[PDB]
Design a protein around this ligand. Structure first.
Ligand SMILES: [Mg+2]
Ligand SMILES: [Mg+2]
Ligand SMILES: [Mg+2]
Ligand SMILES: [Mg+2]
Ligand SMILES: [Mg+2]
Ligand SMILES: [Mg+2]
Ligand SMILES: [Mg+2]
Ligand SMILES: [Mg+2]
Ligand SMILES: [Mg+2]
Ligand SMILES: [Mg+2]
Ligand SMILES: [Mg+2]
Ligand SMILES: [Mg+2]
Ligand SMILES: [Mg+2]
Ligand SMILES: [Mg+2]
Ligand SMILES: [Mg+2]
Lengths: 184, 120
RNA sequence: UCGGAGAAAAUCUCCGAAUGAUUAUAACCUAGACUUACAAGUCAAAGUAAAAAUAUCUUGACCCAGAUAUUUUGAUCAACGGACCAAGUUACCCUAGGGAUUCCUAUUUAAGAGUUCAUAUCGACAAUUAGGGACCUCAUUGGAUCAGGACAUCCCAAUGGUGUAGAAGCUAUUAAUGGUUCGUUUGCAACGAUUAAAGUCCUACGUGAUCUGAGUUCAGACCGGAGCAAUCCAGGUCGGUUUCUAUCUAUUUACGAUUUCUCCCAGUACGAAAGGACAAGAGAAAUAGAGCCACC
RNA sequence: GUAAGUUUAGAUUAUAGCCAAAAGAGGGCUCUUCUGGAACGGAAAAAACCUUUAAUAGUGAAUAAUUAACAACUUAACCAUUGAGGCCUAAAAGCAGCCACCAAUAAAGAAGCGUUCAAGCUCAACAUAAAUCAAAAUUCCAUAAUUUA
């Protein structure tokens, strides 16, 4: 159990940032239970306090601990009113761990996730692994001969007249700041 | 919106593809039958030009072209507006005598004897 | 006007120049090019001539006037492609035209309030693809008549919950039924006396070919403040004329009621007292609708 | 693959677009660049979306696009055994509070909670049987319809 089990404080003062698949904080580091971002959104300091206060009160110092998986607010906002921390879909906002089962932390993590600015979910190591396995399984066993990548990459049907350059990389999974899970 | 370069993998066939379309990877066919089946209106200007270069100004009228890389390069530009079918010569190339008796079938066969009579 | 740096080439972010000092004094001539609407602006082999190669570093036309004896010089012409030389004001105005005329509220969450007890009544952080509102400055809407409609319900009606004993209340569901007053000071409010209640909004201030007060806003005139004056001020004030015979559409001949108070049940049920019901039942009015004339 | 291009001579008009899509720059809008469009058909009406090489007569034919589409996953009825574990609130009982995190047993640690604290209402044991998702304001506004290859 880390000595500083409780969440630390966050300093108030130190378009594509949330428009694609995440490349950071996508893997569990120390904890087993964490909140997974399912969309792109900006986390201002107010959200940070809600996560800090709610999680700290419930967690047991003897058996539980938590850590932050995202940087403090650094991006300027003007009417320099305040700074917002960008987050990409797939990021782990906060990580929890300890000699506890997922079910114990499900309620608090899910409650915290609901109040986040973007859609989010509470996932353990197993659940995150299961989600990826299901995604790969769906792609392999898909019975639709046509897929977004092949049509877009090969410019079949003259499709690229109606597509953005970024669409080829995303392959239709991501539209704007929203992530479509079922879309293979 | 700019011209696109298709990855080379698109034009590398697979063993099942040869089975489906019935074309041997060896002894490749010589001549294409190309017909325009979509309109050049609302298409970028480069597509409009290649269609005129290939002679496919009228739709649903077939044109014969060489199955050589330079011709193929233009065809790849307008792949979506045309239908490419391999010309077949069941009875061989037309000679001087048979030049006036030919007919191009929908199947892709240029028959050199056209009688308009029951097969019997 | 031009030059330097960023954005990175459309508008934005910054610095400088209308030269400066140094000097070897840096010639004439002539291929090919850059740049460029025009105009202006760049680089330069070869040849010749001086010397014994070198100018180094960081911009204004034409005309017209000059100066010398060919050679040259004239712009905060800076509104910087530059009229040789001209400012205010107009509400007395005119013509040609172009225009316009944070805070609620509904959901989700629930630390903390509520002695105890999250959700009787509420409530931090937040969540709704959720609904409405250079130094100075500032400008359509009342009323009358007749109202159509929404329901996010002010009263009337039917109900759930309570920290609902009764009586008073609080909260929520349902319902658009008919109703929802008269004045005073007011220019927006500010009060008085009532009521079962004096709802919140939409209809181009709903409605000016139905009517009316402001305002926009002028021709006259004063103060206060500007300006040398004419004049001026989004500062005061007093005065001050918009007419219309309806062509078309549309419209112009019934209904089957709302509310309040008193009486009774009963000063009972309830309640320590204080105080004080419901339904059931009878009678009065007020208003609205439809009619009538024996009386007044 | 294809038929255009340079130069010479002459010449006006034009110099305010419009909407969709794509990438940026400022900061929803607004500038800049790239692509397309101007139906008589379809999207309801529909300049700007999709289908459409010109324009002719015909009581022929094959076709294109074509506002339509088919809520989502374990309590069953049962049983609960001390020295009050101490100490800070007489003393604090699974249990005011804090720390041990406790007792034998076929089998039970104290879960809610009760309790001034113990009242004890009784969870888990023993002991019995089965068991996460995908179509507000004039007056509603085509009519209808679940299966014939
Ligand atoms: Mg020139
Ligand atoms: Mg030389
Ligand atoms: Mg000028
Ligand atoms: Mg100029
Ligand atoms: Mg006057
Ligand atoms: Mg009405
Ligand atoms: Mg209602
Ligand atoms: Mg009128
Ligand atoms: Mg009249
Ligand atoms: Mg006068
Ligand atoms: Mg007057
Ligand atoms: Mg008078
Ligand atoms: Mg006046
Ligand atoms: Mg009339
Ligand atoms: Mg009664």
């Amino acid at each position: 159990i880390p000595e500083r089990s409780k969440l630390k404080f966050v300093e108030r003062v130190p378009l594509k940032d949330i428009r694609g698949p995440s490349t950071e904080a996508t893997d569990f580091t120390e904890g087993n239970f964490a909140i997974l971002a399912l969309g792109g959104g900006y986390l201002h300091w107010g959200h940070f306090e809600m996560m800090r206060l709610t999680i700290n009160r419930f967690m047991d110092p003897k058996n539980m601990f938590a850590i932050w998986r995202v940087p403090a607010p650094f991006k300027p906002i003007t009417r320099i009113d305040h700074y917002v921390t960008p987050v990409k879909t797939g990021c782990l906002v906060v990580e929890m761990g300890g000699r506890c089962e997922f079910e114990e932390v499900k309620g608090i993590l899910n409650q915290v996730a609901h109040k986040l600015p973007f859609p989010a979910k509470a996932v353990s190591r197993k659940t995150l692994e299961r989600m990826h396995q299901n995604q790969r399984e769906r792609e392999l066993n898909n019975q639709n001969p046509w897929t977004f990548e092949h049509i877009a990459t090969a410019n079949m049907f003259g499709i690229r007249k109606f597509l953005s350059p970024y669409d080829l990389t995303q392959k239709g999974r991501y539209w704007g700041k929203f992530y479509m899970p079922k879309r293979v | 919106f700019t011209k696109s370069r298709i990855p080379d993998k698109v034009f590398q066939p697979k063993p099942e593809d040869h089975e489906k379309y019935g074309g041997d990877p060896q002894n490749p066919h010589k001549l294409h039958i190309v017909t325009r089946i979509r309109s050049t209106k609302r298409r970028p200007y480069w597509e409009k030009d290649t269609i005129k270069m290939l002679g496919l100004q009228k739709a649903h009228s077939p044109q014969i072209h060489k199955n050589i890389p330079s011709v193929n390069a233009k065809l790849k530009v307008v792949k979506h507006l045309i239908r490419i079918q391999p010309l077949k010569l069941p009875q061989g190339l037309p000679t001087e005598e048979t030049m006036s008796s030919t007919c191009l079938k929908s199947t892709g066969e240029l028959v050199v004897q056209w009688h308009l009579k029951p097969v019997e």
